[PDB]
Symmetry: C4
Subunit: 354 residues, 4 copies
């Protein structure tokens, strides 16, 4: 923008805070006709036109939107539309308004369905509209008094979709963007792996829950314990019986018959008797460990060691190429954050009417 | 197959669901003499001949077989042959029937023991027959009323052997197959490592269980606690005494004699007195940590970093080469999933008789 | 220094312990005019001039400073200035005295602000002065009786800043220094990743704490449980309800209607009824696992696999280049550890006065 | 040896079990003058001369020694020399007897101190004599009735030194040996890292234990809890207060003053009041996470990614070179396992006498 490009970044965040800090001699400009000749009003105004600053105002506004909404859903969730619930309603509206606005700006006569296909082809835009569709469903779900609790679950999912959106910060980074490109490549196969590990672990869970107990009258309470325990032992922790794996251990390795001195029990508790001795416990628990913490781990890191080396170099220039359109966007974007962008959306509608 | 090869894959799964979705204009064909001139009966029929579809019907049938059997073993396990127990009996039979069928199809006069050696040489076929042998043993084990509980343990193991078989899905993948090839290389040495880590951790477990308690009358209850705790601390979590490691701590680092101001105890609780003070606890617990979460981890990732770079390139063309025979198989495979494949097995036997 | 360079290192640490061990024939010298002709007084004196030894005396003194201060803060923390509190006060003073001393030694007429900029440009010096500023604030915070407890928190933070400083040991290592250089490169982006994972997990925490309970009257007790549970499940362990995830499970996968034999419940506990059945529990708990233990892990190891290969080679010579100034420093540094360096600081002030 | 080299390995282990399995046609030979012309006595005898078999007999005997000793120390530990205690005494004696025996076999007139230096230079021999010195100390420690409990701790350490010795198995492996070479390179720096992570985590432990409680009267009970909790949270699990981190949470993020609707508390519980509110808990717990599960992990994997690529290639031929002397050893080694090697040690002493 207007200001000098060698001032670092922390000085932007600090001068953003204290208005007169711009008036002081703690920020740099170029073209000393304005740096030395101090008109604070124009200097602050020009400061506000730098896309770097407008970018940071957006990121701060987004931060506020996210954590405020979180608070409202956290404690202030109430059947009657609270003031804050309407606040985020209009706040989100103003945000999607700007998003949709950038679809019709085309100064040339671009095809309408063409630019739609491009938006619909972008992974990031795809996730954004996913949240929009999910929210607008959750809104009426909350509005219906018979589905308030579902209303909570959908709005909670919406929150998550918004908070994972912050990976966008580093797309303009000096040193992180390229790595975002890489994980964009990985997204495809880490999804598919996710599947197989899911069915993997639940097959182990139900195996445990089947053998170490008789039939349970309800699966309802089973999964309350079993899936919670699954959550915990996703990383090999608790088999599934916190109260102890074997309700009745028995028998021990071939020993105790030592003519010199017994060491431990030794009897067929196993085939001749109900398979519920410590021996079965050893077999089952070691089986889980035989595969869980090893097979899937070496597999993944092999996948990544492979794929990484396939994209390591050209990923650089691709990021550099991508840099353009983002810069063009915020260069031309109106200088107002979403809370105060409404008056600029009114100006746009004024142009839309005339 | 007959249909166009550029329709993606989600459209196959969606058109699979809704019969008239084929009749609608939401799926592509080639040779517009059939795409434009709509005979729905032939269009759906031709759709059903595509090996891509027959593949998906198999994968859905297999999914159902696995989860239904799981349910039956989960809760409906009962001494008297339940209806569902017989259902999976015949369902599995129909599945191994098709498998054995593909051993005798050879249109040329191939040696009988030759094609047997090839089947027996295939790791995947090896695992399949492992499950077959284990199941058929478990069947009679359940049938004997004196070994019902063992019957549960064997059938549970059978289930696991079937569920790990699903890695076969991605052998036809665009981007995962090659990595399956790699782990097929790794299978050899990750097994051998598995051994040494097993004896490693149990040596630590028995060490703990030996020193921090007097002789236990039964190893039976020991392993009920010790091996469960081992399961948990497979990843360095609980030493083995959830009730606290030291039943009686004592003594502290050389301190407390500070002429200025004491800081902590300081006495030989150690050599002169029974080695059961906090000092021994510090020594033992840190010893576990000295090696467990470090030695074996850096070892493995070194192994993989090494071996990966030995197979990284030619693995590609090997997968491409392997692609053929699978495609040939499902091209020629009769178009019926296992539940409904029985009538086609009857047609084959009709040819076998005449 | 004076002594032979091929004696290894353990012999330095052992001869350091036992004064007459120098007098014995268990250490090497060069220039056998002193090795064979034994003047123990000069031999031990010359031994004390070797920067290798002076280095080790510093590292032992630093070790003592750190663990003694820890003890004093551990148990002997008391409102009235204890003897030991004053001991570390003067001990730290003597240490920063030597540090500041090395800023004015310049034998040439170097610019004063220049050498200040160089000190201020050094990451390691930056962390050192961070601790100095934090300590001197904590000192008066403790001194104020109304903020004793804050006094504890600041002094505890100070301790941590000192103990992480010990990575400096290996900067002179044969084989570790170069790797310190690498992580100095990594410091930048592992910080930024730290941010996104922080906001990531807390978004999941508040999501859990929002849906599986009604509004809590106080966030105070929430975070006492929720952030402790967050600490635990930073690595996917406990969702947030150790007392069980679902306070009331209900409904089960589409089953139980099996005309042959029921397997589990099956009812809309979900949309038609308050979204608090086991089905919601399965959805939420698996969602956490869908992303937490996978997305961020493969991301990081991709980042490191990338950046490592960008610095792997020239890092070597850079370390070799850096080696000089450290050697020059301890060569010229006065031969006294901080406890006994005071008399040498007096000699320096004597030169400063005259 | 005598038998054919293409028989695999499982057939060795199976024919080892069943004596007549050698007499059957399920094992291969070369020089069919003996394969076809069956003299079972000579065939089994020749089988017993193959170093491959003698190797396996040693590995089985060693396995038995280790697990039997474990049992004896596990439960049968008793002040009076038990029969089994004397059994392992003589068993170990017979083992070190063979080891020392291989020091004097030199058919040439090799220097006595030379071959001693070579033995003392070998890492593996170094660990072996470490166990010997530790055992022989533990023996008399047990023998003294006043130090029985220390006797337990030393013998338990001895056990560990023996069980980690089994990594020797894979030194003759086809595919693992080379990787053992690599970790032999790593041993140096993983030790040094071990140090810094140790002092790292305990600095965090004492920090926690200092701030979240007043002075404890005894460090004795502190470490019983704190070091056990440290053991658990070595991988970021439990801070140190399983009973809850904050004994009294208070204050909440700047909120609750929302003119629309309160969300949470908001007061200076922090500086103006004793620093023991939830805010301090958030600060401390996140601080632990800021560094523990990230800094040290990316550091290590960087170290290994670096060093691995420095040794990846020549490690191969080094293993191949090393292969010789092991083969020569067991070729010439007398054909008897330690239990039955005694009679062959007698024959050697017979030669030693005459």
């Amino acid at each position: 923008g207007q200001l000098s490009v060698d001032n670092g970044l922390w000085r932007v965040t600090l001068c953003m805070l204290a208005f007169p800090l711009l008036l002081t001699g703690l920020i740099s400009f170029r073209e000393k006709r304005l740096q030395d000749v101090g008109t604070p009003a124009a200097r602050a105004r020009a400061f506000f036109t730098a896309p770097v600053v407008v970018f940071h105002l957006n990121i701060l506004s987004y931060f506020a939107f996210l954590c405020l909404f979180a608070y409202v859903l956290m404690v202030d969730f109430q059947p009657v539309p609270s003031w804050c619930e309407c606040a985020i309603y209009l706040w989100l509206f103003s945000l999607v308004c700007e998003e949709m606005r950038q679809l019709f700006y085309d100064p040339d006569e671009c095809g309408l369905m063409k630019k739609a296909a491009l938006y619909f082809s972008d992974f990031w835009n795809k996730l954004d509209v996913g949240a929009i569709l999910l929210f607008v469903a959750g809104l009426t779900c909350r509005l219906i008094p018979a589905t308030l609790y579902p209303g909570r679950v959908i709005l909670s999912l919406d929150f998550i979709l918004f908070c994972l959106r912050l990976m966008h910060i580093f797309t303009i980074s000096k040193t992180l963007g390229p790595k975002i490109i890489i994980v964009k490549r990985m997204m495809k196969d880490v999804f598919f792996f996710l599947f197989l590990l899911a069915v993997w672990v639940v097959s182990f869970g139900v195996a445990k829950q089947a053998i170490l107990i008789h039939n349970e009258r309800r699966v309802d309470w089973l999964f309350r314990g079993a899936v919670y325990h699954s959550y915990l032992t996703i990383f090999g922790q608790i088999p599934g019986y916190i109260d102890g794996v074997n309700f009745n251990p028995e028998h021990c390795s071939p020993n105790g018959t030592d003519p010199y001195k017994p060491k431990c029990p030794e009897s067929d508790a196993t085939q001749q008797r109900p398979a519920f001795p410590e021996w079965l416990t050893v077999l089952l628990l070691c089986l889980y460990l035989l595969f869980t913490n090893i097979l899937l781990l070496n597999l993944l890191i092999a996948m990544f060691n492979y794929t990484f080396q396939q994209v390591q170099e050209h990923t650089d220039q691709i990021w550099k190429f991508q840099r353009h359109d983002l810069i063009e966007e915020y260069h031309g974007r109106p200088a107002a954050p979403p809370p105060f962008i409404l008056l600029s959306h009114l100006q746009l509608f004024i142009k839309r009417v005339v």
